[PDB]
Each structure stands twice: as C-alpha cells, then as structure tokens.
Design a protein around this ligand. Structure first.
Ligand code: FAD
Ligand code: FAD
Ligand code: MWZ
Ligand code: MWZ
Lengths: 489, 489
C-alpha cells in the first residue's frame, strides 16, 4: 500500500548502511534511498560510497601495512642466502599511494555499478539531516542553511554515519594530521610523531617506520603507561619491546602541550617533561567519536548521550520507533563486520519478520601491527572480576626460521583464559605473524563454547605457529576471587 | 620388583619413539633405553636422534620452503614501491644449506642434553633387532652378522623405526636422489626433474624452483592425471595452475623408463611418450614404506603385512602382547603429531593404567607448497559414498593486495563439505597463503562436531582470508545417493 516515496532512507553508505540498503532492496524488494557525501574517496571529505572501511580505514590501512612488512622480509631474506644490493633499498612512497588509490578507486567504481544495475536502490549524494521521523533532507554542505537537493519522504530511517577522529585541542591542533590525511600524504615523512596508544596509532607507526626515507625515524608517544588499553597485558608489553627492535621509539606518560610551525615547514612540539622536538609530520590517533553532530537529531526527537552516540535498544532501534541506527554512530564495538551484522539483523528485524539482535560478546579482533595481534573474548583482568576461579594458560616460543633470518625479537605468544569450574575458554590472546588468520577460526570455537579440553585433544599440524594451541595443558597460574595465586587452593 | 635391565626399549628415536621414551622415564619413573643409528643428522644414514621429522623431514623442509618464498615476495615488493636491483638477485644455496645444518645440528645437540640430564633414560647408538619378545640387540651395521654392541634385556618393546623412500626400480635407479640426498646437495640444480605427485614432490618442486640459479627450470613429472591424490579435486587443479605461473612445468601420464649417465655428469632421461631429456639432478618422491625389513621381526613372532607394515590393534599392540609399534612403521596416517599422540597414548595404556587409542578421523593436514594447502576431514568424493545427502559450499577470491603485487594467479580457495541432514561439517579444504595456520583452528571445531551453522554465525575479522569461512551460507551444489546434482530434491 504505497503511501511514501521510499520504504527506507539510509544516512551513510558505509559498511553498516550498504549491507542494510542492499538486503532491503534485493531480498525484500523494498524501495531504498542511500545518502553519502561523495562517490569516490579523497579530500576534503575522505569517506565516500563504501564507507570509512573501504576509503580511509581497514582496506587501505592493510594494503599499506603489507607494504611496510617488505622492509622486515627483505632483511629476513639475507639469512636464507638472498644476496642482493642493500644500499639501493629505500621504498618509493608515491608508488604505494598511487597503487592504493587505483585499488580504492576501483572499489568505488564497482559500487556505482551496483546502484545503476540493482533495482529499487538509489544513491543520493549530499548531507543527510532529519526534519521529522518520516522526512530526510539532503543539502550541498553540512551548514544547515545550504541549498537543499532532495526531500526524501520515507517510512523507516537508518542512521549509519559512523565516526570521526578526535582532535587534541591545544595551541597547535590545526598543524597535526589524522588517519584521514595520512592516506593522501605526498611524501613519506623523515621525522614522524604518532600521538596515541590505540590500534590505529600502532598500525600507522609500523607503516611510517617501513616507508621512512633513509635516515628517518618514528616516535610513538602515548599519554598513559602501556599502549593498547584493554588488550592482554603481557601481549602489550611484548609488542612495546618488538616495536622497539623494528626501530620505533615508544614514549609514555607524555602529552604534547603545544605545536608551533617552523621555517622549512616542519613542526616544533613541546611536551609534558619540558622537551621540545622538530618533526616533519605529526599524527593524532586519540579515539574516534560518532558523527551525530550535524544530523539535526534533536529536531526529529532521537536520543543522544555519550559523545553524540545514538542511544539504541538491542535490535538497533532509537527512541523513535521507525528510526534505527547501526555501526560506529551507536558506539558499541567499532569494527566493520559488527556493523555489517547489526545492519543485516536490522533488515531481518524490520522487513524480514524474523527479529534478531547482534551478538557482541566474544567477537574476534585484530591489530595489523608489525608484528600483528589476534584477540577474542576477555582479558585475564576482566575474567577474574566476573568469575570465581580463573586458569591462565600461557606459551611463548620463537620459530626456528628466525635463528636463520636474524629476526630473533619475533616471539610468537599465545594466552588462554579459563573458567576453572568447567574449563570453558573465556579469552584467547595471540601476538606474532599469522595471528589475525588463526583467531578467526578460534572465534568460531568460542562461539560453540569451547573448553580447554577441546584444544589439547586436537591432533596438531606440524610445523605451525597455531599447533601451540593444542599443546597447552598446565595452567601457568590462576585467580581465585580475582586475586593472582601461584597455585590453586 | 626388578627382574629385567630395562622396563622399555624403544627402536627409533623419532617423533613417536622420543615422546614414548621421555614420558615413560619422567612421568612414570620407568627405566628406558632408546636405540637410533646416529646422534646428529647427515649422510650416509640421514635420520638420527630426533627422527625423520627433525633431520630430513618437516623441520628442514619448512626452513627451505620459507627460503623459496623470498623469490615470490621480492617480486611482490616492487608493486608496493620497493625499488632495488633485480639483476643482482639469484639465491645462494650454500648459505641456505649452511644455515639449515646449523639449526638441525643445534636440535641434535639439545637432545643429547636431554639424555645426559634426564634420569632412567639412556641412548644406545646402533642397529635395533629382536632376538625374542624380551631381548633387543644393537649391532654396528644392519648386516645381521655385524659386531653386537649391546643386549638389552627388557619387559616391553616399542617399534618406531618409521619409513624410507621407495625407489623406482628401472635401468638408472641408482643415479636419482631422494628427499634424503636433496637436503645435502652441494649445488642448487640448473635443470631439475621431480618425479612423483605426493606432497613431498610438490614441496620440493617449489624449493628447487625458488633456488634455481638463473636460466634454470624445474619439471614435475607424475605418472597419473592430477597431482596430490586424495586431496580435494578443485584444490589440486588450482595448485597445478599456480605452480604453472610460479614457473614449474607440470607433466602427467608420464613415467621415466631409463636414466643413463652423461659426459658433464648430468642425467639423460627416457620417458613413456618416447621423449629424452637431460637434467642436472633427478629426485624420486614416489611414496615411503615402513622400515621393518632389518629388525628380525619374524624371529620374535610379530605380524607384518602391507609393505612391511607392523600389524597392530587400536592401542598400538603387535601380535606379541609385550611388543608395541607406533608411527610410520605401522603405516596409518604418516604425520609427526599423529606418532607423538600414538606414543603418548602407548605410555598411558601400558605404564599409566589409563588405557587410550589414538583418534585418526578428522586430523588436520598441510602441504608447504607455494602456495600452501590446509585440509581436515574428507573430500567430497568419499563424503558422497558414506553419506546419503551432501552439501558442498565453495568460495574463490583474490586478495586485493595482489592487484598491487602483480601476483594475480594467487587465488585463495575454501571448500566446506556438509551432511545435508544435520549440517555437520565433514571436510574443509583451503589453498593459499596462511592455510596451514587457519586449518589448525578448524581442526579443533570439527573435533567438537561443528555444523555449517556455527561457521556463518561467527562475527568476522576484517580484513582476513579466513573471514571467508563465516560468509558461506548457500551450498554451491549437492550429492544425493552419491550423484552430483545442480540442486536438491
Ligand atoms: C584507520 C582505520 C582502520 C580501521 N581498521 C579496521 C579493521 O582492520 N577492521 C575493522 O573491522 N574495522 C576497522 N576500522 C573501523 C571501520 O572502518 C568502521 O568500524 C566501519 O566503517 C563502521 O561502519 P559504519 O557503516 O558504521 O561507518 P562508515 O563506514 O564510516 O559509514 C559512514 C558513512 O556515512 C557518510 N556520512 C557521514 N555523515 C553523513 C551525512 N550527514 N550524510 C550522509 N552521509 C554521511 C560518511 O561519509 C561515510 O561514507 C578502521 C577504522 C579506521 C579509521
Ligand atoms: C620430506 C618430508 C617432509 C615431511 N613433512 C612433514 C610435515 O610437514 N608434517 C608432518 O606431520 N610430517 C611430515 N613428515 C613425516 C614425518 O617426518 C614422519 O611422519 C615422522 O617422523 C614419523 O615419526 P616416527 O617416529 O614414526 O618416525 P621417524 O621420526 O623416522 O623415527 C625413525 C627413527 O628410527 C631410526 N631407526 C630406523 N631403523 C632403526 C633400527 N634398526 N635401529 C635403530 N634405529 C632405527 C631412524 O634412524 C630414525 O631416527 C615429512 C616427511 C618427510 C620425509
Ligand atoms: C546487477 N548487479 N550488480 N551487482 C553488484 C555489483 C558489484 C558489487 C560489489 N563490488 C565490490 C567491489 C570489490 C572489488 C572487485 C574487484 C576489484 C576491486 C574491488 C564489492 S561488492 C555487488 O555486491 C554484492 C554483495 C553486496 C554488496 C553490498 N553489501 C552487501 C553485499 C553487486 C549485483 C547485481 C545483481 C543484483 C540484481 C538486482 N536485483
Ligand atoms: C634436565 N633436563 N633436561 N631437559 C630437556 C632438554 C632439552 C629438551 C628439548 N630440546 C629440543 C630442541 C629445540 C631447539 C631449541 C633451541 C634452538 C634450536 C632447537 C626439543 S625438546 C627437552 O625436552 C622436553 C620436552 C620433551 C622432549 C622429547 N619429546 C617429548 C617432550 C628436555 C629437561 C630436563 C628436566 C627433566 C628432569 C629429568 N627427570
């Protein structure tokens, strides 16, 4: 019974939005309108058709991490007897950026193919904004007195506008770059300062390190004690050391007070401890907050709260019953396959009839550091609060192939966290090469409620780094009533 | 009640033997004697303390596969903008062999540390042989009229002498090398012929290819149709193509009739189709048979059969109740972590009191080809015989990073085999980089009896090759009553 122009309007053609949009349009034959600000990546808006992940997140970030490993792998080759010229070896950053752009640009092109070819699914380039719970407006600019391009009469609204990097707010904030501007840099920087301790800081530390032009260096500088908060505490310490030996100088309890410009265009940076220093480029990876701040949410009566977060029930529904919100705008788990799920399960809830919420517990996570981390489930810290008796299994070995390659800093590390009672696996925490591949399969096991029994009853694959999961039988130590004990009562 | 000199005599200090030996000695305080032919690796006996795996199998083989990838990874680097000299690039094979020997030799040294330091555990260098069910003899040579070094009065005997490469038996057999002689080659061969279609042929094809000195080439030559029998049929076809594009010429329905020597020391090789050709070195990887053929088994009354195989019940026990046999000598699954388990469960059976057999079904396997294979559980061929209704899920994608690297032949491939009835996962079959790491975790899931439900209910790790396990929902096709059908009745 056609009353409105569109069944669904989606603010943001991101990981969350596109999954919701596409499903609604092809599997339930709804008429869908998807709003985004631009159709291909790049400044000054960065995000585009495909979302943060495709244009300025996971996909480019990984392409450039893969680049920066070639440094560590061309060093490693010498031991296996690859003689070749190690004077004529610095990486050309322009060839990396050009290649990365060709790729992201191909994905943006393959999405316009999707819209023109898919029926009932339209793309509306501009700036989303609510008037009431059934009308979405598209402007030229986010300035609310801009020319209005379209008025989208609709039944349901899905807010999936994602998040945006937080600024430092000090004298000199406007001289620093972000995850956004890092991707379209013209030159790889000789002297680089990565402020922050989050996964993005550490991934980008490894890139700029890999692509430093000759006599260059990278300083990571984090305002706390130990990088990567709410990761396993021995994995963080082991990475902090391994970044050290790949060339990255890590500093802690350290915060920029001030950045002035310089003569040759470098950045003078004043710190906590008094210290000043010059860096070519300075990058802020200090958390990412929701983009609610220009959607005129207050106008159509949807609940805001912690940093603009769209306040939502388990089934992704806002304080207005026809308006829903998914992905980073909601501020739950800020990963791409989470948003995809939340959006897939929004379509099943609303249009599909088959109502479902998203599972947020024991989701497998990965850091594309050098070396990388895989993690799934809980730290031993938050285990020993929520569980009576906790076993901690732990194992750290160095692949023999590193006794050849020279890379003897590269410790591979596994930790398993247990409920003593029934032996259930609560957490798994890996560091070292191939950890992101291995954890994906572990994430399946912990969904089926795997016990430590099930790991060490499994015949191994020899020789592998993963075969050390099934050789962990004795707990290293325990927690009873959340206090660390040598051995169990 | 001490009646005999030793509780346990172990023929062969291999993967199986050492696990049995060590456990018996430290966890059950038995007096153990371990017999092997030499203490460090190398010709003319090759195997030594640590077994085939440590000296001339898995461990060296992987070190040298890791070497040969540096070829494909230095090519790949150029696209990510690693300018460097690609004239001055051939691999030095002597630096690889020297480095490999330093490693294997360190492991042999770390095992003599284990014997001198561990109590009740002695090492007896020579050639094992039964006199009766309670006496083992050690000779200088395998020639049964050799000088006798020791007479080991014992209660239990464990036969774990492993296996040995099969010869071709044609005019010219004694000119060809094997897995054994390949490891101690002086020069990497310009023109290499790998006869065979088994995992060892294909791993070693990739090595000799990686380390060919300049204008050199490798021919794989298999007497059948499609290499790697009893692997998934689309994975075999995909590898056959990818070996092709890494440089390896594969020939099929082809068997050497004759090898004569040559003038400059190369090998003239006559084939089925008439064809002759000269190769520097020619390697036989055409199956590996048990080493029973010199243990005087018939003398002490233990059951032989299929190619010398020691005929054994589920708990590893021979036709004589005090004699047991594990690992490749038994001719079950010829992998190292299998033998380790069979030996660990021999010690639990006999000395431990807690009797247990080894689980052989759904053991995860891996080929260190370039690119590598991970496999666990059954082919779709042997599924559709033993199961009424079978679903086959299948997915083949190319990581975007190969649109940069130039390696566009590198297809990553997953196949899942299902029981239609209950959705149980019977088999998993992967090809492409990191497949051996991923399958280890899958092997755990299929031990817990994982359904296809459990895979695609799991939030992904983005971006990963493994995340394509959890995005497989629609079966590609089915088998009902073991006949391939487009769609299900
Ligand atoms: C450097 C980096 C690396 C990352 N790496 C990973 C990783 O490895 N794995 C992982 O799982 N996640 C990763 N993430 C996170 C991932 O990118 C996000 O979690 C994911 O994109 C969230 O999906 P979404 O749809 O909620 O947001 P988005 O994909 O950001 O969707 C928001 C879209 O809406 C548009 N938009 C914003 N405001 C408006 C408006 N007013 N009108 C119209 N359109 C608008 C934006 O332009 C954008 O296209 C990374 C993020 C970054 C920054
Ligand atoms: C090239 C190659 C690659 C391989 N790769 C892998 C792999 O990646 N993964 C995997 O799981 N498996 C692999 N294998 C198989 C693995 O090496 C064997 O399955 C494993 O070693 C079997 O253990 P075992 O104890 O039965 O035999 P072994 O380890 O061979 O033990 C036999 C030992 O007994 C000794 N011996 C023999 N006769 C006598 C005698 N009369 N008296 C005394 N001692 C004697 C031998 O010298 C040897 O030390 C590979 C094999 C080869 C050849
Ligand atoms: C006509 N037509 N075009 N397309 C169509 C066309 C395209 C895509 C994609 N392209 C990329 C770019 C990846 C890349 C490939 C090669 C090189 C670089 C990048 C991602 S996804 C697509 O997405 C289906 C899954 C979805 C998509 C939305 N997210 C959810 C999943 C559907 C499909 C149809 C048939 C539909 C009939 C209409 N009723
Ligand atoms: C005194 N002492 N020495 N050792 C002792 C000493 C050594 C080893 C090994 N060394 C390697 C070499 C690997 C390498 C390391 C570094 C560089 C290259 C190679 C493998 S394993 C060892 O194996 C314990 C598990 C077993 C072993 C048998 N297979 C089964 C598992 C026990 C141990 C003790 C205490 C025992 C007290 C005696 N009652």
């Amino acid at each position: 019974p056609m009353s409105r122009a569109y069944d669904l309007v989606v603010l943001g053609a991101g990981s969350g939005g596109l999954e919701a949009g596409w499903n609604a349009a092809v599997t339930h034959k709804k008429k869908v309108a998807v709003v985004d600000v631009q159709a291909t990546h790049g400044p000054p808006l960065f995000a585009a058709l495909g979302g943060t992940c495709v244009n300025v997140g996971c996909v480019p970030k990984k392409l450039m991490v893969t680049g920066a490993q070639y440094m560590d792998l061309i060093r490693e080759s010498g031991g296996f007897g690859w003689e070749m010229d190690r004077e004529s070896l610095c990486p050309n950053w322009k060839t990396l950026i050009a290649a990365k752009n060709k790729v992201v640009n191909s994905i943006n092109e393959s999405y316009k193919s999707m819209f023109a070819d898919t029926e009932g699914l339209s793309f509306h380039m501009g700036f989303g904004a609510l008037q009431d719970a059934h009308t979405v407006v598209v402007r030229k600019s986010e300035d609310p007195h801009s020319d209005v391009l379209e008025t989208l009469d609709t039944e349901y609204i899905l807010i999936a506008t994602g998040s945006w990097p937080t600024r430092l707010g000090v004298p000199g904030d406007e001289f620093c770059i972000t995850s956004n501007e890092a991707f379209y840099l013209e030159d790889a920087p000789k002297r680089m300062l990565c402020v922050g301790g989050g996964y993005i800081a550490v991934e980008f530390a490894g890139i700029f390190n890999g692509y430093k032009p000759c006599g260059g260096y990278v300083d990571l500088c984090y305002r706390g004690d130990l990088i990567l908060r709410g990761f396993d505490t021995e994995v963080r310490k082991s990475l902090t050391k391994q970044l050290g030996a790949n060339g990255i100088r890590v500093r802690t309890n350290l915060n920029p007070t001030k950045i002035t410009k310089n003569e040759d265009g470098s950045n003078h940076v004043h710190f906590n401890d008094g210290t000043e220093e010059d860096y070519d480029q300075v990058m802020l990876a200090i958390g990412r907050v929701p983009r609610s701040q220009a959607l005129q949410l207050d106008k159509a009566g949807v609940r805001t709260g912690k940093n603009g977060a769209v306040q939502v029930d388990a089934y992704s529904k806002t304080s207005v019953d026809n308006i829903y919100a998914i992905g980073d705008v909601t501020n739950r788990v800020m990963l791409t396959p989470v948003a995809i799920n939340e959006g897939a399960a929004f379509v099943e809830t609303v249009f599909g009839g088959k109502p479902r919420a998203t599972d947020h517990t024991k989701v497998a996570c990965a850091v594309f550091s050098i070396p990388p981390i895989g993690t799934c489930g809980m730290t031993e810290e938050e285990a020993a609060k929520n569980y009576e008796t906790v076993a901690v299994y732990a194992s750290s070995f160095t692949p023999l192939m590193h006794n050849i390659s020279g890379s003897k800093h590269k410790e591979f590390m596994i930790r398993i966290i247990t409920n003593e009672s029934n032996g259930e696996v609560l957490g798994v925490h890996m560091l070292g090469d191939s950890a992101p591949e291995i954890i994906q399969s572990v994430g399946i096991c912990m969904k089926m409620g795997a016990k430590i029994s099930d790991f060490h009853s499994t015949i191994g694959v020899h020789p592998t780094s993963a075969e050390e999961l099934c050789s962990m039988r004795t707990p290293a130590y325990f927690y009873e009533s959340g206090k660390r004990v040598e051995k169990l009562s």
